[PDB]
Amino acid sequence: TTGRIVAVIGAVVDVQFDEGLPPILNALEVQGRETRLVLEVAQHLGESTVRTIAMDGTEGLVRGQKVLDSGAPIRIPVGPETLGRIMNVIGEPIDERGPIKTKQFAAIHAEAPEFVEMSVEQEILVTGIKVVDLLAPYAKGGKIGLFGGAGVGKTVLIMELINNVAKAHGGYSVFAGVGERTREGNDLYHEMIESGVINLKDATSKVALVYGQMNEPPGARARVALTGLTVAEYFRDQEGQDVLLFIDNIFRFTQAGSEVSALLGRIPSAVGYQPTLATDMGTMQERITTTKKGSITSVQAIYVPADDLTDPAPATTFAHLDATTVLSRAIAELGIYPAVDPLDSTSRIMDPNIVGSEHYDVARGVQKILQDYKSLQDIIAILGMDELSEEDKLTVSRARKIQRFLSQPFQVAEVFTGHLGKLVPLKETIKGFQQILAGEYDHLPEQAFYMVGPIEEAVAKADKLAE
Amino acid sequence: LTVAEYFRDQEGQDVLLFIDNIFRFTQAGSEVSALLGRIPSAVGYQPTLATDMGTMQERITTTKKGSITSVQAIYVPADDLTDPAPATTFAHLDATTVLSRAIAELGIYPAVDPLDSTSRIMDPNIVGSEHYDVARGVQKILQDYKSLQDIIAILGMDELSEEDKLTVSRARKIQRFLSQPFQVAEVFTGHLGKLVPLKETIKGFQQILAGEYDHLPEQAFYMVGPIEEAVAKADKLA
Amino acid sequence: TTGRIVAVIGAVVDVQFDEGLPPILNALEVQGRETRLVLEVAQHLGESTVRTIAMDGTEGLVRGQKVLDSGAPIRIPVGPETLGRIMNVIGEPIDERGPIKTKQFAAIHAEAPEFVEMSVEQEILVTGIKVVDLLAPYAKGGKIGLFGGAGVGKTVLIMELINNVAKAHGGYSVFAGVGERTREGNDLYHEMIESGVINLKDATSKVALVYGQMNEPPGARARVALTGLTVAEYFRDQEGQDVLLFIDNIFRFTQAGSEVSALLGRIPSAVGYQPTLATDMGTMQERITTTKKGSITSVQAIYVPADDLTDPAPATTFAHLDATTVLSRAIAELGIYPAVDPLDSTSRIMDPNIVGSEHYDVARGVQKILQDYKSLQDIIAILGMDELSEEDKLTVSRARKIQRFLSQPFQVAEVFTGHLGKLVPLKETIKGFQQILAGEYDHLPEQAFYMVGPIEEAVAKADKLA
Amino acid sequence: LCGAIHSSVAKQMK
Amino acid sequence: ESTTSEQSARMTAMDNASKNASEMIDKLTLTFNRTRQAVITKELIEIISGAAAL
Amino acid sequence: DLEETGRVLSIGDGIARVHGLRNVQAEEMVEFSSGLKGMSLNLEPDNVGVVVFGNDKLIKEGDIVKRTGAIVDVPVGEELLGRVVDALGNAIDGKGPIGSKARRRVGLKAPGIIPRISVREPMQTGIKAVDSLVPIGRGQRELIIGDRQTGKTSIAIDTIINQKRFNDGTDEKKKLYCIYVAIGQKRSTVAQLVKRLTDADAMKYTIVVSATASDAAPLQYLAPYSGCSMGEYFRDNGKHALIIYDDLSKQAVAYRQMSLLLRRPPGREAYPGDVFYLHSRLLERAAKMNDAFGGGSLTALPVIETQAGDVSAYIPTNVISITDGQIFLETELFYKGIRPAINVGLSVSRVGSAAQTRAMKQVAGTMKLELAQYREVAAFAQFGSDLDAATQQLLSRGVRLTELLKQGQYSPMAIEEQVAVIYAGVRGYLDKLEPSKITKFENAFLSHVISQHQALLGKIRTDGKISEESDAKLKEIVTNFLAGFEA
Amino acid sequence: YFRDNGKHALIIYDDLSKQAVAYRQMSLLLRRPPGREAYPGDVFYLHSRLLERAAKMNDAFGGGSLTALPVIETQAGDVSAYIPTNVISITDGQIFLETELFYKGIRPAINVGLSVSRVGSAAQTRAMKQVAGTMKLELAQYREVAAFAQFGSDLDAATQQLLSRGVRLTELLKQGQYSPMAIEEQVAVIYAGVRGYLDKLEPSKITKFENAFLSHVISQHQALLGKIRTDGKISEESDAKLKEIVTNFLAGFEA
Numbered sequence A: 001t002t003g004r005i006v007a008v009i010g011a012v013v014d015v016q017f018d019e020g021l022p023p024i025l026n027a028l029e030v031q032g033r034e035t036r037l038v039l040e041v042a043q044h045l046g047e048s049t050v051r052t053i054a055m056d057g058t059e060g061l062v063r064g065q066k067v068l069d070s071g072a073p074i075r076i077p078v079g080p081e082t083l084g085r086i087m088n089v090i091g092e093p094i095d096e097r098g099p100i101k102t103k104q105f106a107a108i109h110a111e112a113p114e115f116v117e118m119s120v121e122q123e124i125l126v127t128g129i130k131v132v133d134l135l136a137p138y139a140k141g142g143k144i145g146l147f148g149g150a151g152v153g154k155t156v157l158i159m160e161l162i163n164n165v166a167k168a169h170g171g172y173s174v175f176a177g178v179g180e181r182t183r184e185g186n187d188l189y190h191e192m193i194e195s196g197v198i199n200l201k202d203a204t205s206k207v208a209l210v211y212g213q214m215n216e217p218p219g220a221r222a223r224v225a226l227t228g229l230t231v232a233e234y235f236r237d238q239e240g241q242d243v244l245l246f247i248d249n250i251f252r253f254t255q256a257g258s259e260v261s262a263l264l265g266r267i268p269s270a271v272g273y274q275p276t277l278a279t280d281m282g283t284m285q286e287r288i289t290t291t292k293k294g295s296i297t298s299v300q301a302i303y304v305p306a307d308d309l310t311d312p313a314p315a316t317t318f319a320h321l322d323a324t325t326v327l328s329r330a331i332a333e334l335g336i337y338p339a340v341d342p343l344d345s346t347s348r349i350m351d352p353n354i355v356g357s358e359h360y361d362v363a364r365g366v367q368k369i370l371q372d373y374k375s376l377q378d379i380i381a382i383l384g385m386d387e388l389s390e391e392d393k394l395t396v397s398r399a400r401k402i403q404r405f406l407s408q409p410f411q412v413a414e415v416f417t418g419h420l421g422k423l424v425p426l427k428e429t430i431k432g433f434q435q436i437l438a439g440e441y442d443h444l445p446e447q448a449f450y451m452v453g454p455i456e457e458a459v460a461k462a463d464k465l466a467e
Numbered sequence B: 001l002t003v004a005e006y007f008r009d010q011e012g013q014d015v016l017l018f019i020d021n022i023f024r025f026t027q028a029g030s031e032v033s034a035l036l037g038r039i040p041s042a043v044g045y046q047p048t049l050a051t052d053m054g055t056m057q058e059r060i061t062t063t064k065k066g067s068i069t070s071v072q073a074i075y076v077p078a079d080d081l082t083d084p085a086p087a088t089t090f091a092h093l094d095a096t097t098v099l100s101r102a103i104a105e106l107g108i109y110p111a112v113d114p115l116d117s118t119s120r121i122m123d124p125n126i127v128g129s130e131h132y133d134v135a136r137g138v139q140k141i142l143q144d145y146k147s148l149q150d151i152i153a154i155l156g157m158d159e160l161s162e163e164d165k166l167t168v169s170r171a172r173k174i175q176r177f178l179s180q181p182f183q184v185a186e187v188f189t190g191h192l193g194k195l196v197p198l199k200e201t202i203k204g205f206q207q208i209l210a211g212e213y214d215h216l217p218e219q220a221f222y223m224v225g226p227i228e229e230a231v232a233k234a235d236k237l238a
Numbered sequence C: 001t002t003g004r005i006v007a008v009i010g011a012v013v014d015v016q017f018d019e020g021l022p023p024i025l026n027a028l029e030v031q032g033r034e035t036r037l038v039l040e041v042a043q044h045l046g047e048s049t050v051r052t053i054a055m056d057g058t059e060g061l062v063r064g065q066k067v068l069d070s071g072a073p074i075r076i077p078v079g080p081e082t083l084g085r086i087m088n089v090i091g092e093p094i095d096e097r098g099p100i101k102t103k104q105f106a107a108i109h110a111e112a113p114e115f116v117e118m119s120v121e122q123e124i125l126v127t128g129i130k131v132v133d134l135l136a137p138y139a140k141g142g143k144i145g146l147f148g149g150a151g152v153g154k155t156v157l158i159m160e161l162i163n164n165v166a167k168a169h170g171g172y173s174v175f176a177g178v179g180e181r182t183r184e185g186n187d188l189y190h191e192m193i194e195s196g197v198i199n200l201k202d203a204t205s206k207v208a209l210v211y212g213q214m215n216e217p218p219g220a221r222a223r224v225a226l227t228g229l230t231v232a233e234y235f236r237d238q239e240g241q242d243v244l245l246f247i248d249n250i251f252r253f254t255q256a257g258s259e260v261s262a263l264l265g266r267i268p269s270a271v272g273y274q275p276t277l278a279t280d281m282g283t284m285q286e287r288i289t290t291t292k293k294g295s296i297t298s299v300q301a302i303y304v305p306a307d308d309l310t311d312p313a314p315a316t317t318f319a320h321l322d323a324t325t326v327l328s329r330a331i332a333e334l335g336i337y338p339a340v341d342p343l344d345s346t347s348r349i350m351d352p353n354i355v356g357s358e359h360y361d362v363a364r365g366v367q368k369i370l371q372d373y374k375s376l377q378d379i380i381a382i383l384g385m386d387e388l389s390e391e392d393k394l395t396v397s398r399a400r401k402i403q404r405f406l407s408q409p410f411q412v413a414e415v416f417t418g419h420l421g422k423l424v425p426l427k428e429t430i431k432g433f434q435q436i437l438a439g440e441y442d443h444l445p446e447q448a449f450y451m452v453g454p455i456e457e458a459v460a461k462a463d464k465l466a
Numbered sequence D: 001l002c003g004a005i006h007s008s009v010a011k012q013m014k
Numbered sequence E: 001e002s003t004t005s006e007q008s009a010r011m012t013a014m015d016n017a018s019k020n021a022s023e024m025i026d027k028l029t030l031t032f033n034r035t036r037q038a039v040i041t042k043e044l045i046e047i048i049s050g051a052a053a054l
Numbered sequence F: 001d002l003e004e005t006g007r008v009l010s011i012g013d014g015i016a017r018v019h020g021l022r023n024v025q026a027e028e029m030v031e032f033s034s035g036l037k038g039m040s041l042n043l044e045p046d047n048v049g050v051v052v053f054g055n056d057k058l059i060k061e062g063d064i065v066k067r068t069g070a071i072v073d074v075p076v077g078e079e080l081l082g083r084v085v086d087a088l089g090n091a092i093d094g095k096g097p098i099g100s101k102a103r104r105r106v107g108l109k110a111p112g113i114i115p116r117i118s119v120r121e122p123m124q125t126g127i128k129a130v131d132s133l134v135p136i137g138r139g140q141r142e143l144i145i146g147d148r149q150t151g152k153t154s155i156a157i158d159t160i161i162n163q164k165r166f167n168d169g170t171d172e173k174k175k176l177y178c179i180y181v182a183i184g185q186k187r188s189t190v191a192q193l194v195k196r197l198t199d200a201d202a203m204k205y206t207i208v209v210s211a212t213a214s215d216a217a218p219l220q221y222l223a224p225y226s227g228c229s230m231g232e233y234f235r236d237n238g239k240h241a242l243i244i245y246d247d248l249s250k251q252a253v254a255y256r257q258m259s260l261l262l263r264r265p266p267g268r269e270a271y272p273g274d275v276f277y278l279h280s281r282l283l284e285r286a287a288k289m290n291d292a293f294g295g296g297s298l299t300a301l302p303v304i305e306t307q308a309g310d311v312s313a314y315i316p317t318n319v320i321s322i323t324d325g326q327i328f329l330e331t332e333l334f335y336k337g338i339r340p341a342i343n344v345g346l347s348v349s350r351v352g353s354a355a356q357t358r359a360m361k362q363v364a365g366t367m368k369l370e371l372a373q374y375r376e377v378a379a380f381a382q383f384g385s386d387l388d389a390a391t392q393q394l395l396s397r398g399v400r401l402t403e404l405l406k407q408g409q410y411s412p413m414a415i416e417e418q419v420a421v422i423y424a425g426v427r428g429y430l431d432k433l434e435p436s437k438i439t440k441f442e443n444a445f446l447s448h449v450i451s452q453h454q455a456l457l458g459k460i461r462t463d464g465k466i467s468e469e470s471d472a473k474l475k476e477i478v479t480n481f482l483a484g485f486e487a
Numbered sequence G: 001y002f003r004d005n006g007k008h009a010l011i012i013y014d015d016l017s018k019q020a021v022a023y024r025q026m027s028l029l030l031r032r033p034p035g036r037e038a039y040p041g042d043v044f045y046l047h048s049r050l051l052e053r054a055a056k057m058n059d060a061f062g063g064g065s066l067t068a069l070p071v072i073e074t075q076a077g078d079v080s081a082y083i084p085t086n087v088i089s090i091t092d093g094q095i096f097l098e099t100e101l102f103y104k105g106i107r108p109a110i111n112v113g114l115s116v117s118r119v120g121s122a123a124q125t126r127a128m129k130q131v132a133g134t135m136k137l138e139l140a141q142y143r144e145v146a147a148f149a150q151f152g153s154d155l156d157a158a159t160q161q162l163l164s165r166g167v168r169l170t171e172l173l174k175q176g177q178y179s180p181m182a183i184e185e186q187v188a189v190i191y192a193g194v195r196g197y198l199d200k201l202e203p204s205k206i207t208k209f210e211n212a213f214l215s216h217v218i219s220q221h222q223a224l225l226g227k228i229r230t231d232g233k234i235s236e237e238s239d240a241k242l243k244e245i246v247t248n249f250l251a252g253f254e255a
């Protein structure tokens, strides 16, 4: 079947087919372009005309240009031949390393796993991050989400998690860069090559890349997420291997949709977001899950518009996670990095019958003292201080030390912390905080914990801070 | 505007253009814009708010053939300076005088906010170092008072360091010394119209900043002309 | 005429007619349904088509279905035989006690009284309740804002007002529940039968009920207020009585409006309220007035959204209120029943050129003495209730005596607390507190002035207390 | 915070 | 005399301090409600306009 | 055949403008050429706005749409107990098909005003914080409202668990069946959910209707109605049923989608003007039928997710005004250690003692009063530089009672056990014990009486209140236990 | 052009907020539906596509670069606006200026706390990295401690020292207009502060000290500045030399 473009406005193009109207979700190959421009059928307006979203620029298109129906949705190459290869939204090799020689391709659009395919196994994934492992530990094969505003450390944290987990990972991994800074992409690409995670010579690459940065049209950003997902889905099912799915930033999926929304003739919903926000997010997120075939530990960086966590985008994302690490700008401003908010992060495995009673007690105890201090803050805000009882002045001091003991110098942010990267094992994490709660280290200055590793480094630093 | 343009160019006469109120120009636009069949922009204003204001304002300017000193009154709807009307006007002025309703309610007239009004002439190599230093010094103390205003509003002025009390006192004297009785407002000020020369204005604030008057009642600086009247009034108050 | 449905979108049904296109506000009876589905015309699209708002579920409607034009707006059964019956928006009996055998029918849509019909004199409706008549006198033919949640004896105060008004004014009452919770609807009905304001055996039913259950569409809930108002209008415009109209609540009346407005495709104004917020409210409130025949005083329960009084809904309602009765739980906890806060409850007619000089000054004195005592409340448990001067110690006792003398046993509580209800006339109410302020009873125990009627009873009680 | 007590006597004690 | 004067000034201080606090609260509640209504109206207008342009 | 059939004019965003079907009824189910079902929500002069019940990928222009005839109805019966079904009752737990014997329509009018009776029979949740201060009755709509991760869903689950007690006994009148409806939630959570209920063996009397995010808006829209009908069956047949709507917020969001796409006039937050009507007619179905009408009851515990605690939001306001109570959960209390984080001070129940066990009423009232006084002076606690013994004592009783309101998750205790622990604090046998140890005491004490004192706990039930004898017995137990605790 | 030709260019977009407004007009007049704040749904792309063009090309691609510095005007300091947020999520950092600081003498009115560089020391000479390094994190903690100690909160040696360093460094960050300092000169003045040789100096005197010290080295110790400009790092000798210069000079300054 062959259609012709009849209207072009933005990334939304309408094509009229003489015969054989292509079903929705199908791709269309715009004929007459030096660049492969794919159009995804989104609506069937009628009068043998269909509305499509462009996966690239519509600039240059002319009304009447012939378009061919591929006869199937956007298919991309999946398999081990993608590892170490940077893939385009529509599966094209944008790494310059020739074509991706895969035996079979896969459609990016698929159905979500049935209810009788989910798992109920929860295992703690020691990422090596104090705040995380202590308060909100991740689950090996559980959906994870890093929330935060523009400038809190989401990207740096996801990179850190990659450094730790992705490297010492038995299996393949996939990284999809949805609407972000290409700069970051180039950096990550070269950094992984250095860490041998991506070998440009011998086949030892484990991380497969997919990108569609902020320089791409709404259509590309709205699908790159699915593209990367499909890649991970293959390794999950037809391979039965542990797949790591890192997405940054997933919010761009929703943003891309709101842009074309108006051009698709939809009535604005709350905060001007598309009325199909939830469903669109659901059809996608639900595919990003662990099945009885394979496990996928997904780590997604979720942007928070104007830091308003009540914004329909991040607000709807919360219900699609098992572990939430909310980043606060306030804590970031204080200087505590990662800027994880200890009173807004939670984990599904934080049950005393999963992470253990001792761990649960320590985590809760830390959260409590912090909350208590938070309540004492506004109390003395502009009312002196010398009135609080020994207990209050004790909780304040301890809470502050714990607060500053949450900051851990990240290897990734070494050029931002001006310190060496440290990793603290869960055991030492529980140990240290448990001891601080016990008030054992109440004879050390607050700064002795500010940006350190194990409690040993805090004590040693304390004595070192003789002057 | 056209009338002014003529004198400016065709006669090179230094034209003084006074418009009151220019904001009405934009307001009228919104009224007809709806009827023009355009899609409303933010706050329902005409989507062409920026351009319209531009083509007009850009005609009210000094050319190499003639000079025009324009003084345009800009009404701020609902006292919202962030409103698309006044906000878009700001970048068209070389000197801005933002009148604060709060200051007016404090009897300080002209109710000019000393920390919001700006001018591109405020440069040491233009108005002089002495003028700039005094100007910034005055703006600084006033700015340091605003921060203290919070604590003052709750724990009074008792929980303040003697230093802060000094800044507060001086700031209030300066704050009042900024008020000047207008002849066109004598029926309200109840004071004869006083005009103060730049030289006396600079001197007056220099002395107060130097603390040379840290002993005179603040009211002695209310509705006065040159600093001399402040001292004189102080004596009359005894 | 018989039209045909040409479109059904939610609760908005468009019907087309060939001959005789029905006017606006006119009712339409859909044919081919078990439950009578009434459509109210509210627009003339054109090309012999009219847009209507369904009064109930439109589920099952098919394009082409016949619709009989009633030729007149929604009419409801009016007359004395509606007392003790729970009526539907369109008048259908929902209490399952058969059809309302009425001979007179009235439409819920009617123009408000003409200017020449407006009474130019402001009278006070003696409810016979000290706290009210004294401090917040109900304006005869005025709107009163009943502020109170639940568990504050709100229902009891309602049942008392009815009993008293009918017993002391021969005027029946009507209760229009806008957005009534079916649960509370059943409770209220049975609770009313117990109080005797409604009877099943003998016809002593002094109230008529109209329920706009939350189950019904916006159009139904928005009209139930009118329906109840029409049932009350009858008594005034026909029997010339002083009817009492209860609207619980008024906020849900406005909400139903914004909703209907929204469905009709009208652009929402500030905070999303319908543009016709002013008119919708006005037209309904304007019917509640005093004419040269009778009067209709309306006690409307008020819900202040987000506790914002500047919000359009409450802002508009206040523009039609004449008095307020703030049922405070704190007061109820102190055992003062009715729990009417003597400092919030206010009335506009509480002006000397209306309620009289004596009444005004006495009421003022009561409010003032209570305020003064309140100021001392702090000093009491701080410096010590003894440091207070004689006058202060006198204000304390007197204020406490008055505070207690504000409680009054309701007849509704007779079939519960086993205490005879009192109907204290305005005269004795004034004289009573007037004497307390004078200190004529500064020698009797405070308990004597608790749950009593006329001051005389308090005196006798004091003797019993010895 | 105890009003003008400390400052008052302070600006007299020294 | 110290203890007395101290409790006197403190009592009067806090007395007026809480009073000022209360006023500040009511003022913020009013400004809050204003922002609250404005917010709803703004979003709603943006929705209506966006719809009335299809 | 523009009569019983039609042709799709346009299809997109789940909306299919079918041309024809001049004999379809409003809200009637239709079938597309792909076999997909749909519901004609919009009946317009030249088209029928049909909402697709699935991926409209299998829908194109010219697709012949035919009328099915039957309206949306779901199977109902005890054969659904222990089964996980979708919004349309179809079994999704894979354990074969359900015995679809009886079938009830999802859209039915709520029971009449007269056919009901005053709520009396208590609906013991198991959480002492609720049963004592916020009692719930059979035939009441109690709203569980709070922000994300406050504990909303947990309050529901424990309530369902506690029912196992009565459901294992011979007390047929106390037996309460439960139905959990999931809307918008992910299958992962729903999986852990049913797994949890199975571990608690509560599933044997729990029906789980699920409508995940991958499900079309209309399915998520029907899920709560179908689940309701499944419960109404019990109610009408005299049996007692409980249903939780998790969440109505997510359902409203999915419904708004249909309206906005159908180009229906958007109101506040873009929600349609009948979004209230949506929840009202649903929640009003819950009721307590009179003996003449079986005598059953359907208690509903809907969940609403608030944003930044803005209860004045459109949907939250709608449901709060339709319910007979609200259980406020504040995350602040959670981190403070208050678990469940049920803000008793704001939580209410318009029913109250009316549906509370007499035994509980006795100790519930005193606790409530004491807690109130505590809150009135709570602020003065942290600034207790110099306070009078009276205020101090109020703070003492306060904190202790607050500790007693704490309860572990997945462990709903019996009413006798609740009144027992309440007795300890209310009577003051904890005013001296440090608050930190109170939590430990409750555990040791309760476990002790449940062991060597089952008779006492039982007597409380038998007497229906704390009898003078049991009052004296408990006195000797608490005093002797106290010394043993601090020695 | 310069970028793809090995040359390095710099571009300032003043003002991007005004461009957006213009675009809004264009789009609205095209009858395209008005979005949030009437701005079109692709306002983000309007700026992303632009800023993303600025990049650093590898040697194979000429090794040229295009550094972009977009300007954005915030209304009433409300960064919760549509455009402000957009741009902040595209750039590799921001520099927020506040009128409050400006009047308070902090000129440039750069708010250290609301400004970051998503590149860091990877754009600083070793010399600057040796002095600057972690001074940012230091100032952050300093401001927090100062805010928490806005009264006599029995400050110990550690906290007091922190406050002292903070105030000193703050003064050294003040700089006028049209007076760009050389990297080595900046390193010298920042050195005196970070190393803490001015900890025993009155903050008001620092204002003049900087200029005096600057002229002192530029005149006589020009060789030191010259070396640093070449080595791009403070050598051991340079560190020792600077130490003797600042200590003695400062000592003589406090005559």
Ligand SMILES: Nc1ncnc2c1ncn2[C@@H]1O[C@H](COP(=O)(O)OP(=O)(O)OP(=O)(O)O)[C@@H](O)[C@H]1O
Binding pocket: A319, A347, A348, A350, F146, F147, F148, F149, F150, F151, F152, F153, F154, F155, F305, F339, F340, F407, F408, F409, F410
């Ligand atoms: N009784 C309890 N005691 C202690 N912790 C509890 C209790 N109930 C719930 N929690 C904690 O609260 C967490 C959140 O519970 P839950 O998922 O029910 O909250 P929610 O607000 O319903 O979340 P969502 O909004 O995602 O449904 C649990 O993971 C658990 O850690």
Ligand SMILES: Nc1ncnc2c1ncn2[C@@H]1O[C@H](COP(=O)(O)OP(=O)(O)O)[C@@H](O)[C@H]1O
Binding pocket: A148, A149, A150, A151, A152, A153, A154, A155, A156, A157, A337, A338, A339, A410, A413, A416, A417, G116, G117, G118, G119, G120
């Ligand atoms: N763990 C960290 N330690 C120190 N600085 C950090 C850390 N994470 C982020 N930062 C600082 O914050 C900046 C922004 O972080 P980034 O995560 O890139 O922003 P975003 O969260 O918006 O993607 C970084 O350039 C760095 O200066």
Ligand SMILES: [Mg+2]
Binding pocket: A154, A155, A156
């Ligand atoms: Mg990032």
Ligand SMILES: [Mg+2]
Binding pocket: F152, F153, F154, F246
């Ligand atoms: Mg939940």
